[model samples]
Target: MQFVNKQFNYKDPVNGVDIAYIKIPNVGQMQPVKAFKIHNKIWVIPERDTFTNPEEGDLNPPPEAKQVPVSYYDSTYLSTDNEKDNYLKGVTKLFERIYSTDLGRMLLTSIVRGIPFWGGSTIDTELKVIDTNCINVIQPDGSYRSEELNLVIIGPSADIIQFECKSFGHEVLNLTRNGYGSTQYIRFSPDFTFGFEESLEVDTNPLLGAGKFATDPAVTLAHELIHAGHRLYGIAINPNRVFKVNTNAYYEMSGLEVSFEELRTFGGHDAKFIDSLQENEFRLYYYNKFKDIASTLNKAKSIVGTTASLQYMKNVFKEKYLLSEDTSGKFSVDKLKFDKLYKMLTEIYTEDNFVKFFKVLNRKTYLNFDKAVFKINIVPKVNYTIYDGFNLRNTNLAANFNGQNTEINNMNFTKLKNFTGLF
Candidate 1:
């Protein structure tokens, strides 16, 4: 009888899920085990080239077949100078590029092949690929070839639809304007979004996805692929459908204050403002840590006060915790005290719900920092499942090449009808 550990390593005797470490003299698999815990295992493996060459090794980038420069992308669609004109240009250019790039052949190949699954079994298809990119000519009548990009049309049954690829690589983004499915630039009014673009043009460049490495087009391509599939199969439609993390602390009301992800629609997902909170929070946490030490000294000074005591405590704070302040012309000790008090109040409000406790201090001692981890609650949604290889191997469906079985055959494409002309 054997038990398996979910994390990568040896198991415990009782539960058989605890992590075990194996090591050596100078270096082993681990230094020491301080506690019995279970989690993902990370092995320390030095680069082989580091030992062999010891220098000028493993530094060059590898060559790949489908390499592309990260910089290749369409410019921003919204014009900062003239909102209307830039948007119109973006629209025209976007369609032109989509028509130019051959998206149909590649997508059709994937549909027909069904992505070559890990096993002998694969996704059965009622789905077929069809091209709708040809320009129609009127033969002395009113007939045309219907050349349009990125529109979905249902087939004769449930398996056919003409999906357009024209929305890719556009300079003028439709901030929140609806396209095929969940792909939207921003969630604001179209007019206002374009106007925002205009404002951006005045200050700086408005183009997104610039200076991206060519070798990493996979990320960009994946984004588009998801967007296209989302048009067919709904995903990321609701902003609240995803999970995120940030400390449960309120921020000062800045003009730019808003949920980072929400603002990302306007500024682009990789926008700086989206990351500002993360950057600010880390610095705040560390700075607040030091400030807490200063607070401790100040508190001691008040309770245990004499000129000698106060001076000694102040020196203790300065020397022990590296608390130094700029003493420029007209610098006042009163101002320094106010700064600490303000920071302390803010920290306390963020950490403890001490309404009455704060009233006693006359808002004199504010919150600076606390060494504690705050647990935040998230919205409920469907959770993703993890697969165990052994468990999958034990399943009834895991039995050998039963591709021709009645149950499997019953799910074939024969019953699927073509779904054409349906949106």
Candidate 2:
């Protein structure tokens, strides 16, 4: 056979299970041989064919040609196309965007999906799609649609430190106190994350397929998806890390760090910090690979929040069991979602489903206080040069652009600056 044009897959001789590769024998070495086990005996496919009379010593074998789909299409994987490919397109787009960065690649394959087969991560090894949307009402009434996750980037009116919790909570962002430290303003797209609108408010549903290309990253989308995974698979939730090889090659942890798949301060499958880790890991990567343009520490953090939130997604894109380190009992998602239904079916005597649910939630690995917290940064440290794709690093300071400063600016993107009375 011609060495130049040949590529095929190997198969089991007796049972015919698909095995491995057939490629151009390189200048470096001969092609690999096939080896498998059956009936407690180790078998070898040395000549590319099964031996009809191995006992009689007929080793000569004939070649066969078969082209098989790559293993990524194995039993546990996302379908190449689905109506939800559009609905959950964050997985489609954000995954592609970050994959371009070396750091992004590491977060995706290693920490998220885990070392392929042996999953110990905050997500599925198949990177199975989790899709149950959860929400915390923003207004306590109905100021905004229950469909929206609202967040704002608040700033001092001018030379004043300010902070605002849109509804008593805002953890995705880690912004500076403003005024006393750095005065430069990092400009994120009106739609990009960590962005402050004229109203200092923007909807981040795009990544979730609702809309806002910037206000949201697959970060929040994966947030709910992960919660969904916790619901479906009773995987333990914890930090998933990939520690090895700056040696520059290993599909696992290819080149990244602790991109956790949960958000901070939430746990028991209600955990939330991994989401931040996912974002931070990807954020630093994007920042380093594309947006390394911060001029100050405050700017660096904004860049981190903006970009980390941008990446936290790639981190869980690969999580198999939420982590491979500490294994857990396989709990059912139905048990987490529909307590009443399964409560009776599973045979229990509790009158209240919520009470029984708490006991279920009481699983040591499930309800322990340690399950939902952010580990210190594991991403490559940043000093800031050019901005990452999100551009949360680069900025343009305004002098007298307009004076809309306040403990909380009723300001737009154009009104941010030092001291400038009204136009």
Candidate 3:
């Protein structure tokens, strides 16, 4: 085996795990190992196989990444007041470009109001853009360094919903409001890798392929914040019904057993389910409120009207449940299924229903509610004789459900515990 620098140090920014080198081995023909302190004792890890290759040139040094300094209270940088204002202006311009219509305004409003109380807390929220990095130890030498990389943090706030818009060429944003509740954390892209305009609004349509929706950052923010709301306030409308996570990770949370082939497919299924429902509920609201508005007001409503956006919502539903491409590359969705979900919203999505949703959240905001509502317990797909016939992916679900042994499709107990612990 070709020998390269045997010493290294690394740090994981997300988890704040720091790894360091203790010493290089003096023995003959041994794999390189690095040591780091986990809690009190030292733990050693083997160098990657690729790092052991002799034919490869000098091993790439570990990046000396740095977290851009930020103020928890301030939104802008030290010297760019006008530039910061321009950036925010641009963001609003983009928001209005797609979200100023009645449909857009209603959905955004519900998202803003309903999501603030997600996970049920009303404390102040803080935003931070964390940059991940590690230290590279040049074998025989003891020198090391770090680097700053470009990354975006779009997610729920630590306390409320705060965003590090500055991390993505903007400014750090602190969002605080009383009587809402604790914040949840989530992340999304601004301009790269399934970005604002290149992706779909939701990733369930067969015709549109599965990916993040193509929309403004605020819309994306609303979607994720609504996810936080589901974490805090969602309840099973029909727990007995089964749900399935498609190959591309799309499913409605109507309570059918949610099945995924692997862990990768497991994530974001429930969030997608809840977020899409919120969108449709907003759609239904606009449809009811403004469907007659064109007649009452002599105004040329932009395509932002619910009637105008219904087609897009129709495609959203089509991608979600009706027309879906399976793992085998085949696409299918019946008109019955499409219309079923389409019409289902009409009956349930109402002002009273939204008020009820908010009421539950409002109560949870102050009162200690049932934590079982926030757990994510997922069982294996039915009828597939895989690993254990059936197993619990979320171990906490058993505890949350009072050891009921009920077969759940999926639930996010970690988020539940995180937010609930704050209280």
Candidate 4:
């Protein structure tokens, strides 16, 4: 279905918000989405569209209590009994902290379903966090191979978000699977030590090994959430290709080629020839992508920031490049390459560049594929004179609601004449 009408409007005076009228299939008719600049960066609004709930039989609801349950890894040799019990305690604590906040819930939900709450409709569903006992826990091998129990959160109208846990090598996560309604789950490593310190049975603490206390997975969770957010906007990790700079050449996954001269001019030879770089290109992508939202939202609530891996990268540059503190106390580099490299690093660290990169990615990488699909759902128009209090509006408000000059209205509109080519 195509959008019959497209315009931008605002919600109210006090909470002035730009709204968009887009035809979203599966959701009700052309509706006014509450559009606003997210952290004054990219514009995102909760869309209000009606969708049919999946059949009761089709709904794969979670286990009893409707909460994401804590599961144990079932293995004798893979994980020790002490390790399982300790990690389970820590993992439970992690989940408790995650589901305790509205941000956490939204982040998790966004991570799972790829989108947060749409307008006023809330998913009347819960998540059941689980764990697995695999020694070499790795990111979901792009396959549904796991020995753990899986559960799906059936949101209002049968909007399903599946959840499952797996042990992996690194502290990373997988968006699990793709497609409109494929089996999606989070395959994360079970390496956490939240409750370990409390379990110590000593008067005083003693020095321990590096892996003594499992690093908090909260930052890790934030990183994965950014990945899911990228996917929500149709950005996926490239199967091959690691970093942009390897041999003075950076490839654009979005089809926008960057010349070696560009890289040289941007960062100089030292930046391009640095060999001590970490393989955290992707995590850097996530950090730079959602830094604004994570940092701002994480102020009162601490769930986002530079993960252990990212910090390691910073340390690498500092030590390897002889980075020093300038008179202003800012880390300064003497070489032109280092200066350019650091500049590029900071430039891409903002939400603006992140969105810019993904805009290209969404346009070129994903959209230009045979298997990849894109659609504007047909949201049926609801019939009711006296609508719900929130969705319903007075004459003046309604009149101004669909007015022109809103942000979306003040832009170039692209019209795809037909999708008859698809079937």
Each candidate structure's TM-score, on Cα atoms with residue i matched to residue i, is: 0.18, 0.19, 0.23, 0.23
Per-residue alpha-carbon lDDT of model 1 for 1-423, expressed as tens digits? 101123221122322123222111112122322111211211111111111112312323324344322111112222233432222222222222222323322322222221110111122211111122111222223332222122211101110111112212223322112211221111011111000111222212213211110111111122233234322211112343221322213222212134332223222222343355653553344344344334443434132212235454345335322345445311122335434532322222121122121111111111111111111111111110011111123434234312112133222112112111110
Alpha carbon lDDT at 103, candidate 4: 43
Candidate 4 lDDT by residue in tens digits, 152-258: 11111111112122111113333221211112223333231111121222101122211111122333333333343433322234434333433211113333333
Off by over 4 Å in 4: 1-85, 100-102, 112-181, 190-215, 228-234, 246-423
Runs in model 2 deviating more than 4 A are 1-91, 98-107, 110-218, 225-233, 236-389, 392-423
Model 3 residue 104 distance off true place after TM-score fit, in angstroms? 2.6
Report, for every candidate in turn, its global Cα lDDT versus the true structure. 0.23, 0.22, 0.26, 0.26
- lDDT by residue (1-423, candidate 3, tens digit) is 111112222332112233444322211244333423221111223222222223322223323353111101111221243432323232323234223334334433332332221111112131111122112332335543331111112211221122322111112211221112122223322211111112233223223322211112333343333333322111112223333533332233322234111111112223233345654654454333222222222222122223325334333323433354457533454446544533332222222223232211111011011121222111213311112111223444223222222233222122212111211
**Residue 419, model 1: Cα distance from true site in angstroms:** 46
- Sort the predicted structures by TM-score, highest score first: 4, 3, 2, 1
Q: Residue-wise lDDT of candidate 2 within 1-423, one digit each (tens)? A: 111111222222322232222211111234333322111111112231112212312222222233211100111112123311221222233334334434334333322222111111232222111111112122323232221111111111111111111111113211111101111111111111222122211111111111111112323222232232222222212335322223222212334332222222123332232345653554333223111111121121111123234224333311322211114322122223233322221112111222122111111111111111111111111311111322223233122111112112222222212111110
Candidate 4 accuracy as TM-score: 0.23
